[PDB]
Amino acid sequence: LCIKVLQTLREMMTKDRGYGSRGEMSLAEVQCHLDKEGASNLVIDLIMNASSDRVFHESILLAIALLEGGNTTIQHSFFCRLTEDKKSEKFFKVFYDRMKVAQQEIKATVTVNTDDLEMSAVITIMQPILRFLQLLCENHNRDLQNFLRCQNNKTNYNLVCETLQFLDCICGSTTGGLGLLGLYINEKNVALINQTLESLTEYCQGPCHENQNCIATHESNGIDIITALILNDINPLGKKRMDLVLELKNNASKLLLAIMESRHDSENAERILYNMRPKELVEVIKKAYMQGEVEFEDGENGEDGAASPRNVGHNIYILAH
Amino acid sequence: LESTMKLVTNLSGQLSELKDQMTEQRKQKQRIGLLGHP
C-alpha cells in the first residue's frame, strides 16, 4: 500500500507532462508546494526506517522530486533536519550501507575481455544513489552540504565524499594502472561511470577545504586513476561511445578543473603531478591534432553544453595554468 | 639540542623507576607470606 502512495508522490512531482481560481503551476512553484509540505521527513525518515528494498530504491527516486532544479529552500530544508536529531549515523550509515554493498558487488562483477548483459540490481541502485547524493551536494554552491561530507554524529558513520571516491575507484578496476583501463571500460557500464564521474566533480567545486583533502590525499589510490582518462583513450572505439568518449573526456577535464581550483598550494598539485608525465602537453597537443582532426562543425561552448573535440583540449589547456 | 637531550634523558629517567618497584612489591608480598605462614 505504501509503495503506490510513495509512487503517487513521484507522479505528483512529475511535471512538464500531459500538457497538449485555478493555480498556475510553477516548476519552482511545484517544488515550493512540496517544500511547503516539507514532507521531506517521508524521505528523512524513510531511509531512516529503511527496510523495503523497493522502498529505499524507490524513495531516492522520490528524492529527485525535491531535487531536480530548485532546492533553494529545499537545500536549506535537508540541511537543518539533517543536523536535526540523533538519526544521522542511523541514516548516513544507511546510505553508507548501500555503498559498501555496491563495492562488494563491483569487486565480484565481470572478469576480463578475451537479451543483453544485465547489470546487477545492486549496481542499478548505485546510479540512483549517486544521483541523489550529487543533487543534494550540488546546489549551485552548497556550503553546508560540503561541510556535511563530515558530520558530528560522533561515530560519524562515513566520510561519504571519500566514500564516493572508492566507489568511483571501483568501477574502473581500481588497480589497473593503465591499458586495462580500456579493458575495464564498460560500454554498457560507462553510463554508470558517467554520472559516477560528475558527482565527484560536483563534490569538489567551490571551497577548497572539503574537497581538498579528498582530491588526492584520501589514500584510496585513484587520483591518477581519476586522471587516467586524461592519460589515454578508450580501446573500444565505439560509435555511440565515440561521443561517449568525448562525453567521458567532457566529464574528464571537469574533474581535473576541480582538481586544482584554488591555487597557492604545492602538494595538492603534486598529486596531479606525481602520477603524470611532463610530456602530456604533447598529449594535449595530440588533442590539438585531434581538434585538428575536427571536421566541418561550428561548435561554440556556450549555454547548456556540447563536447568540442578542440573544446576538450580547450578544457585540457586549462591544466596548463 | 634540547629535543635530543630531553629525549635521552627522559628515557633514562623513566626507565629507572622500574627497579624500585620490584623491591617495593616484594615487601608487601613478604607481608602476605607472613600471613600465609602457619
Add this chain to the structure above:
Amino acid sequence: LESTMKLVTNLSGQLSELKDQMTEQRKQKQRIGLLGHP
C-alpha cells in the same frame, strides 16, 4: 643556561645507569653458576 644544565644533568643521568647493569648482570650469572653447580 639551558645548554649547560642539559649537559651536566644529562651526563649525570647517563652515568648512573651503569651501577644497575652490573647487579643485573650478576643475577643471570648466578643462574649460570647454579647450572654449573654439580
Add this chain to the structure above:
Amino acid sequence: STEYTGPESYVAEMIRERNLDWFPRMRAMSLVSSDSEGEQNELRNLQEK
C-alpha cells in the same frame, strides 16, 4: 544556468546586486606576501610545548 562552478558562479551571483566590490580594488597585487615564515614560527612554539 548550470554554470561553471562556484569561483565562476560567484560573480554571476554578484552581478544582479550592483555592488561593485569584487574587482581587485586596491589590495590584491597577487605579489609575494611571504607566508612560509608564520608557519615556521608556529612550528617554533611546538618546541615550547
Add this chain to the structure above:
Amino acid sequence: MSDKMSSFLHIGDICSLYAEGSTNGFISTLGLVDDRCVVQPEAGDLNNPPKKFRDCLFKLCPMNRYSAQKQFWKAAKPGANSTTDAVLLNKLHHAADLEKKQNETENRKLLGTVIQYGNVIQLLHLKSNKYLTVNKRLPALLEKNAMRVTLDEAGNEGSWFYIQPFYKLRSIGDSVVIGDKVVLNPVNAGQPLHASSHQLVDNPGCNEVNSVNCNTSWKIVLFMKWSDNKDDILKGGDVVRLFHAEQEKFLTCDEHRKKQHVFLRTTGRQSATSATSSKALWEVEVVQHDPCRGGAGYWNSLFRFKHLATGHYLAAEVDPDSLVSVPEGNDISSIFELDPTTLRGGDSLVPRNSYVRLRHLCTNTWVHSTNIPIDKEEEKPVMLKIGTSPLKEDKEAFAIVPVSPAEVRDLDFANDASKVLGSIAGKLEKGTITQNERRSVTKLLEDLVYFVTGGTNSGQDVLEVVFSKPNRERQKLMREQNILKQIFKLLQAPFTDCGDLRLEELGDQRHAPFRHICRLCYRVLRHSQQDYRKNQEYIAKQFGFMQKQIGYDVLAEDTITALLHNNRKLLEKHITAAEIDTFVSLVRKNREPRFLDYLSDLCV
C-alpha cells in the same frame, strides 16, 4: 620482565602454532617439495618442544590483495587457448609486478601493530617462504569435507583469515595475548581449520589439518619479538658456518668409529661459500630461561648451538677425552658463554656479527686449537684436532658467519629430493605405485630442472637458453648432496625393469613413463657439465650408463656434454677408460644403417 604494555602479538613477528584437545602438538610441513601439513601427535607440548621443530615457525603479515595478479594468473593458465598477446598479456605483466611490489612495501610499513580480533591475518611460513591457504573447492583427500592445505608463493586466494577466541573472555576488536586459544578461519571458505584424527602412508607420527564445523582451539606460543631481525646480528633461529682463520672452518661428520673428526680439507681460504654443507651448518639458539625454545639473544646468552644434518650439540671433557656429539642438552655441559673481544663490556648488551671466542659452561673453559691429529686416519696428509683447556689467550677466535636464508632453503630442497627420490626410485623399478605419483615425480623433476638453472621457466622444455647462466654454488650443492647418484640409480632401475632391449620393452611398448623421465634426467646431467671439473670427476662413474644407452633417447647429448667442452685431462681419464674400443665397438655393434653416432665418437 620489565613490561609496561607489550607481549600481545604483532604484525611483522614470527611465531608458532600448537594444537590442543583431541590432538596435541605443533603444525609442520614434512617435506619441502611436498604440500602436506603435518601435526605431530606425541613429541611436542608447552614445556618440551622436540628437536627438529625449527620448521614449525610461522611469520605474521598484513593482507595482500590477490586480485590483479589472480587475473594475470588466470589468463596465463590456459584452456581458452586464445585471446592473448603481448599487447594484452605482457602489458599486464609489468602491470602486475609493481603493484605486487607495493605489497612488499606495506609489509615493511607495518613493523608492529596490536592485532585485534576480526581483521586479516595472512599467516606465513619461515623456511619455505611459501604460505598456506585453502580453496573454495572440496579436494579434501582423507576426510571428505571441503578443504585443502596448499603451501603457495603467490597464495593470495582465500589466504585472508579472521580470528576469534574460543572463550568469551575478549571481544571483537581487542588486543590478543600470547596463550590465547584462538579460532582461525578463512574468510571465504567458512569452515575453521581443525586437527584431524587420521594417519596416512608416511612415518607413524603423521596427521594433517582438515577444516570442519567443529573446533580446535589453538594457543599460539611466542619466542621472538619484533624490531630485531637479520640486521647484522644473531637470533635464536639463525644458521651459521663457524669458520676459523688458521684454517677457515671446522669439520663435523658422523664417523662409524665413536670419535669424530675435524680434518681441514688441505686448505681453507677467504671464508667463502666454497665449503661442504654437512660439515658446516650449525644453528644458534638461546635459552631465554624458559621451557619454550626461545630467541633474540642480546648478550649473556649462555647460548648453545645445534647441528643441522643430525641433532647434536657441543660438549667437552675439559682435560680428558672438542666436538663431542651429545643429542640432548638440558645439562650445564652443553651451554657456553662467549667473549667480548674489543666490544668492551660493562653493560654492552649488543650481539655483534664479527668475531667471538669461546668458554664453556659452568667452568668457563677456554676452547682452543691444538697441533695434534687423532691418528686413527692412517696418514691423511694434513689434519688437526680441536682441544680445549682453561688457559686463556687471544688467539683462537673464529667468526660468526651469517648464512643467507636463500642458501639454506636451497640446501634442504636438495636434502628433500634425496629423501623422496632416493626412496621411490628403488620401488617402481621393483613394483607398482600409483600412476598419479608418476605425474607427481614429473613436476618434482620439472621443478628441479630450472631450480639448478636459477630462473623461473616461461616455456615447458626450453632448457637450452638458460644454459648460459652458471652458478657453481648450486651445482656444488647438488654435487655434495646425493641427488646425482640417486638419479643415475633411477636410470639403472628402469634398465633392470626392461631387463625384468631398453628401447624395445620399455620405450617401444608404453612410450609414456620412461622416455619422459630420461629426458627429465639427461638435461639435468647435461646442466652440470659446463662449470667446473669436479662434476666431470663424476664421469668416472657415469660412463657405463652412456655405454648402455640404446633407445636413441635424449642421452646422446651427454656424450657431447662429456665431449663438447674439450676435455684433455678429463678425457685423460674419460677416454682413459679405454672402453672406446667397446664404445665405438658398440658403435660398430650398432650395425644398423644409423652410422652417424659412431662418426661423432671418432670426431670427439
Add this chain to the structure above:
Amino acid sequence: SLVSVPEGNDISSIFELDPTTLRGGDSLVPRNSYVRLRHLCTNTWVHSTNIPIDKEEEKPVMLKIGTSPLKEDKEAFAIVPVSPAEVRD
C-alpha cells in the same frame, strides 16, 4: 568453593587477583574489565568444574564451583560495577 565464614582476619579469607593482559611489573592501576582468582597464602587457582553437589535430587542443570592449584586462562569472571542508585533501591 563458597565457604561461608563470618569473621576473616585469617589468611584463608584474603585473595590475590590476576593481571590478564594488563601487564604487570609496576602496573598499579585497578581496571574494570576482567580478573582471575588465586587464594591466600598458597596462591590457589579458583576455577569452575562440571560436577553438582547432588543433594538437590535432580535439578535439571547445576554446577559446583571448585578450586585447585592448576593454572589456566579459562575461568575469568568480570568485576561488574553496580550503579549506586540500584543498591539504594
Add this chain to the structure above:
Amino acid sequence: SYNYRVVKEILIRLSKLCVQESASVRKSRKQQQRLLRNMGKAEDTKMQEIMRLAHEFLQNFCAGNQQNQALLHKHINLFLNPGILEAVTMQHIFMNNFQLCSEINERVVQHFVHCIETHGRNVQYIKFLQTIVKIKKCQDMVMAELVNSGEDVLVFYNDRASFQTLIQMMRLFMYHIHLVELLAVCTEGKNVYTEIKCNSLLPLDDIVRVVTHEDCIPEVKIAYIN
C-alpha cells in the same frame, strides 16, 4: 517439522498426478511448480529427507514439460558446482534433445570439467555429462571439454590399466568403463578437436582394447564396440 514432511510427500504424489497429462499439469501448476522451484542445513534429519524427496519430485514434475522445463532454466547453477549427490537427478531430468541442442553454454562444460576433478566421484555424472552431450552439434561442443584436460579416472591404464582391469574382472570399475565409453561416444569423428581426440584415444584403445577384448569381461564387451 511434522507438517513440513507431509507437504513433501503430498507434493511427490501431486507431481505424479500432474505428470499423467503433462500440458494440463504444467499449466495448472506453473504456479505451484514455480513456488517449489523457488523453495529448491546439512544433516540427516527431516530437512535432508525433504531435500531428497523434493529432488525426486522435481525430476518428475520437471520431466513432463520442455517449455515448462525451459521455465526452470534459471537457477540451475546451484547444483553444477555441487559436483556430487542429488544435483545429478536434476541434471538428468534437464535433457530433451532438441532443447538441449538448442541451448547450452560452455560455462557448465568446465562446470563438470572441474567437476571431473573435484566434487566427488560422479558415477552417474558421466551419464549426467553424456546426457549433457546428448548429434555432432554437441559433438562440436564436446571437443572443448575433451580438449581441456585429462581427468578420466585411471581410464587409460595401459599395461597398468590391464592389471587394473584384471583386478576389476576379479571384483565402480564397471562405472569407470561406462564413463570411458561415454567419453568415446562424445569423441565422434572430425572436428579439429574431434579428429585429434579420436586419434589419441583410438590408438590407445586399439592397442589396449584389442588387448582387453582378448583378456575379456562381459560388460566390457558391450562398451568396447562403442
